[PDB]
Amino acid sequence: INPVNNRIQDLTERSDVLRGYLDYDAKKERLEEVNAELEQPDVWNEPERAQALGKERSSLEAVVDTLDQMKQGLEDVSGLLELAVEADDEETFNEAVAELDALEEKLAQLEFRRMFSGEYDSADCYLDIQAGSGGTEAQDWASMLERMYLRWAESRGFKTEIIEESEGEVAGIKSVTIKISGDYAYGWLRTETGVHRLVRKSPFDSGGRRHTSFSSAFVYPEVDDDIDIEINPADLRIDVYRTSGAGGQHVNRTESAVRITHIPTGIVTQCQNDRSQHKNKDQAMKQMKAKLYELEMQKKNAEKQAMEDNKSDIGWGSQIRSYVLDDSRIKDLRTGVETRNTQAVLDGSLDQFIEASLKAG
Template identity: 65%
Template sequence: MQAPPVLLHSAYRDGAREDEGGPGEAHRVPPLSAAGPALILARSELKRQHEKIHRSAARNRRVPNTKETPWTSNTSTPSATNWLTCANARPSSGGIFDYDEKSRRLSEVNAALEDPTVWNDPKNAQALGREKKSLETVVDTIASLERNLADNAELYEMSKEEGDEDGLRAIEAETLGLAAQVEQLEFRRMFSNPADPSNCFIDIQAGAGGTEACDWASMLLRQYLKYCERKGFKATIEDETEGDTAGIKSATIKVEGDYAFGHLRTETGVHRLVRKSPFDSSGGRHTSFASLFVYPEVDDSIEIEINPADVRTDTFRASGAGGQHINKTDSAVRLTHIPTGIVVQCQDGRSQHSNRDVAWKRLRSRLYDHEMRKRQEEQQKLEDTKTDVGWGHQIRSYVLDNSRIKDLRTNVEISNTQKVLDGDLDAFIEASLKQGV
C-alpha cells in the first residue's frame, strides 16, 4: 500500500491541476463543476487534513517540496512513518511528533517490563508502566492516523470512480473524525518541557484584601478542581488553610494525569478579580488578587540530594478541620530549605510522621522545579521561579460585573465568565502554550 500522504496528495493535487486546465499525472479527477457535492466535500476535507498533518510534520523535519517533486502512483516515495517524522530533526525539536524516538523508547520500556526482575524495584516498575502508557498514546495515535488516512484515500479513489456519493459522504464524515485526532496531536506537540508528562502541584495563595481575597482564592480552587474534572485528571486537596471569615488563605492541589503539568504550567502567576463584593453591604466594587504556582511532581526515581543540615523543621498544631486529635498535638510540619528559602508545610495527616513524609516529598518536588527554572533562566533569561511570581506578575483579569475575563499575555478574552469559573480554561491554556508564554 502506498504511503497515505502520497495517496492523499495525488488524490487532490492532480484533480486541482486538471480543474485549472493542467495535465493530470496519475489519478484524473473530474472538474469540480462536474462533480457532485459529496465529491467536492470529500476531496476538500482530504486535502485539508493532508495539509494540516503536512504542516505539523514540517515543524519537526524537512519535508519534500511537493511543487518540485511531482509524486505519482509510480513514484518511489517515503513511508508514511518517515513522512510524519524525520531522522534529521534535532532531538530537542521532536516533541510529540518525534515518532521514531518514541517508538524506539517504547521498545526499550517494553523490554524492561518483560524482565522478571523489574518488580524487584516496584517504584521503578510503576514509573515504567506510566511511561509505557504515555508513549503508546502517541505511537498508537500516529499509527492509527497512518492506517485511516491510507484507507480513506483508497476508498476515495474507488468511490470517485464509481460515482458513489454515499461513499464519499462517509469518507467526509470519517475525515472529520481524523481532524479531531490531528488537532489533539497539534496541541500535544507543544508539550516540549521534559517535565510536561508529570503529575503536578498547584499552590494557591490569597493576596492582600482580607475576606474578599480569601473568597477569590476559594473560587480559584473550585475553578481548577472543575478544570481537572473536565480533563479527566485526579485532583486531591493536600493542604488547605481556611480564611478567618470566608474562603481560604492558601491551598495545595495535587493533580495526577497524563501531561498534567504540561496543561497547567502556564497558569502560574497572579489572577486579579474585580467585582461588586458580596461582603460589602454598600455594594462597592472591589479588586482582589490571588497567586498560583504550578510545579511538577518529582518521580521517586529522580535523584535529588538534600543536605539535612540545610533544612529547618518546625512543628505546630494543625489549624484546619480533622478531629480532636489533629488539633491537640503538634502534628503539622513545616520545612524550610535555607539555601533557597523554599518553604513547604503539611498538616492534613493525623500524625507528625505522615505529615513529615508528605512535606519532604513536596520539598523534593519544589527543589527539582527550582533547579529546572534556574536552568531556563540561564538559557532564556526568564524570571520563572516562585520568588519572581510577585503581585506585579499579573496574567489574567476577571472583571465579573462587565462579564469579561482577559489573559494579559495572549489577549484572549471571554465574556462567558461563569463558564470559565466552572473550569473551561482551554482557550486560555491553548493560546498560552501556542505563544510559548
C-alpha cells in the first residue's frame, strides 16, 4: 500500500501500549481533579504542598498533552498524503514527510518517560549471571544465557567486556561477569534482573528427560568516585591525659596518651603505644580514620540488606521468562508476551521483551 502510511500504523503500534498502560483517559481525568485542588485560595498556607503539585501538574502534561495531540495526528498525517497522492502534488507529497517526524518526536518525548525510571540509566553496568544447581544442564544454560545477551549487546552497538568467568567441570560455565560498556547500558538491562526459566529435553542425562533448570542474571552499575572519610577537624574532640606510669618520674608527668572522640557519632579512639604525644596523635587519627570509614561501610550494607528484604520475600515472582523449548514457545511471565521463535530468540530478539517489559515496568 504505502511504506509511509504503514509507518504511521507502526507509530500507532508503539502508541497503543502507552495508551493502555498509563490509561491516558484516566491519566488525563486525574488532572482536572487536581486543577480544582490547585485552583484554591487557601493553598498558600501549604506552600510545600503547592510546590509539590505545581510541577506535578507539569509531570501530567508531557504524558497527557503529548498523547492528546498524538491521536489527532494519526488521521492527520495519514490523511495529508492520502489527498496528496490523488492529485500527485509533489510538494504536498513532501509536506507529509516532515509530518511523519511530528508524532515520532512526540513519541520520543514519551521516550524520555520510558527512560525516566532510573537515576543511573546512562551508566555502564555489569551483567552477572549465576547458575542454579541443576546438575550440568544448568551449567550449560548459564553459558546458553551468557551468549543470549552477549550476542544481543553487540547486536545493538554496546561494548561488551568480559571481566570474570567460571567454567563448568564437564561442560558449560558456572558464573560469568560481563561488563557492558557504553551509554544507556544499565538503562536497557535494568529489566533483566531476575531468574530466567528453561524447560528442555536435557542431553546430558543418559535417559534424557525434560529438565526444568533456572539461571539468574543480576545487573548493577558499580560506578562511583565519591568516598568521604569526613576527616574534617570541626568534629573529632581530642582529649589528652597521662599514662599508667612505669617509667618513673617522666611518664607520670608527660601527658602522652590521647583520645579521639567523634562529635556527631561518639566513638572514642584512644592510643598510648609510643612515648610522644605527636606520635600517638597520628596513630589515633589513623585508627579513627579506620573506624569511621568502616562505620560507613556498614550503613552501605544496612541499606543494601533492607534493599534485599524487599526482594527475598518475592520468591516465585523473580522469574522473568520461560524458555520452554520442548514445544518451541517463550513465555515472559511478567508481562504476558508469548513468542514461538526460539531459534530467533537466541540471536537476541529480546527487543519485543524490552518494549513490553520496560515501559510497563
